[PDB]
Design a protein around this ligand. Structure first.
Ligand SMILES: Nc1nc2c(ncn2[C@@H]2O[C@H](COP(=O)(O)OP(=O)(O)OP(=O)(O)O)[C@@H](O)[C@H]2O)c(=O)[nH]1
Ligand SMILES: Nc1ncnc2c1ncn2[C@@H]1O[C@H](COP(=O)(O)OP(=O)(O)OP(=O)(O)O)[C@@H](O)[C@H]1O
Ligand SMILES: [Mg+2]
Ligand SMILES: [Zn+2]
Length: 353
DNA sequence: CGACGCTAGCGTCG
DNA sequence: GACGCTAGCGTCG
């Protein structure tokens, strides 16, 4: 018996006018920005643009509130070392060396000039509407802010792409084999991984973090175990729809419940990483048939619940890293969310309404 | 430039 | 209400 969630999907879906209004300005800022950066004999003249994040993978919710974009530099002969046997972070050992310090590139050193350039470049158009948000320490992305027409943010991430084989941390991860098959799985691994300037502790300046944003986007585009899943000549799965609700449930919790100390740590990547685990858990399209929507979402929420209690949410690409690890997040934070979702699951999801 | 797939929005319904 | 058009954006060359 319908919750009914389908209405919830309808509420969530972006305005066609909304996107077009938002869309055209975003590319315009990025395309111009890209063009000017390429022209200048900066190190970043070589930059190529990669579009990633929710909107582009098409799981954006309510409104085009935010955009994520990646600027990738192809870097050759790269060598790298793990900071402290942490799957996410490495420093790249090593020809433009201005940013480099001590034969190892400094993200902080490298990022700072990049952010500096954008700020300089943004100043040219210098609309009151367009500005660069103040740096947040431990943030690797320069953030554009557009006050026209409405408040919206675009995240620019500097990207170093390596044609090298994926790091050892990766290999156990990404078990799409049952779901998507070895051929597909093997092909994904062949595509290059990316490096971004995030640092684990509490301080660090020259470490980097791996990004598989391009890979995640790819699998989201092609979730189906069948080639035709969600195609015109194929049955429609509800996987993407399941994801939106999950994204929506959490976001509604922060806002509607109201922000709390425990709530802040949790972010949309956790649901997305969690959702993938379920897809691995359940690799058949028949299981995800649209008419079967209601159970799956429940199945989706249940898994998330288990994770919080278990406190184990291994990174999809890196099994070793636990997103839900206590050092990453304290227990009381888990409990509270757990209960609220717990409350939510039993009560028929009023928060959506 | 130019294909096409995807999705929002809407008309028809055999 | 399920189909099935349309328009428009995103994408890889
Ligand atoms: N496109 C992309 N963006 C990333 C990636 N990793 C981190 N970011 C960016 O990092 C920003 C937020 O920083 P987080 O990585 O989430 O770290 P955090 O623990 O939440 O702390 P904050 O930096 O303050 O947000 C986001 O806007 C992301 O765009 C990635 O693999 N791909
Ligand atoms: N904490 C994180 N850890 C690791 N990777 C991340 C993290 N946070 C964000 N990313 C990368 O960034 C991309 C987008 O992250 P971000 O939260 O900024 O936007 P989004 O989740 O895709 O969109 P939305 O606002 O709707 O949730 C993801 O696809 C992922 O690859
Ligand atoms: Mg996003
Ligand atoms: Zn599907």
């Amino acid at each position: 018996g319908a919750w009914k969630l389908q209405t919830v999907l309808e509420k969530v879906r972006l305005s066609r006018h909304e996107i077009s209004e938002a869309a055209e300005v975003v590319n315009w800022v990025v395309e111009h920005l890209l063009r000017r950066l390429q022209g200048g004999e900066s190190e970043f003249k070589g930059v190529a643009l990669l579009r990633t994040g929710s909107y582009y993978e098409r799981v954006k919710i309510s409104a085009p509130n935010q955009f994520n974009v990646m600027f990738k530099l192809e870097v050759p002969r790269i060598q790298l070392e793990e900071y402290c046997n942490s799957g996410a972070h490495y420093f790249v050992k090593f020809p433009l060396e201005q940013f480099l310090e001590k034969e190892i590139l400094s993200a902080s050193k490298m990022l700072s000039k990049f952010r500096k350039i954008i700020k300089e470049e943004i100043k040219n158009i210098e609309d009151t509407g367009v500005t660069v948000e103040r740096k947040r320490r431990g943030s690797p992305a320069v953030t554009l802010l557009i006050s026209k027409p409405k408040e919206i943010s675009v995240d620019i991430i500097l990207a170093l792409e390596s044609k090298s084989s994926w790091p050892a941390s990766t290999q156990k991860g990404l078990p799409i084999s049952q779901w998507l098959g070895a051929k597909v799985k093997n092909n994904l691994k062949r595509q290059p991984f990316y490096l971004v300037p995030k640092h684990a502790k509490g301080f660090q300046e020259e470490t980097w973090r791996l990004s598989f944003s391009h890979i995640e986007k790819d699998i989201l585009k092609n979730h189906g175990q069948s080639k035709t899943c969600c195609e015109i000549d194929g049955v429609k799965c509800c996987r993407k729809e399941c994801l939106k609700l999950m994204k929506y449930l959490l976001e509604q919790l922060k806002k509607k419940f109201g922000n709390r100390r425990e709530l802040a740590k949790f972010c949309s990547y956790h649901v997305k990483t969690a959702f993938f685990h379920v897809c691995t858990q359940d690799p058949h399209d028949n299981q995800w048939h649209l008419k079967n929507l209601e159970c799956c979402f429940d199945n989706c929420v249940a898994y998330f619940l288990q994770c919080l209690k278990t406190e184990q949410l291994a990174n999809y690409f890196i099994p070793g890293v636990n997103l839900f690890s206590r050092d990453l997040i304290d227990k009381p934070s888990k409990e509270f969310l757990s209960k609220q979702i717990e409350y939510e699951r039993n009560n028929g999801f009023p928060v959506f309404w």
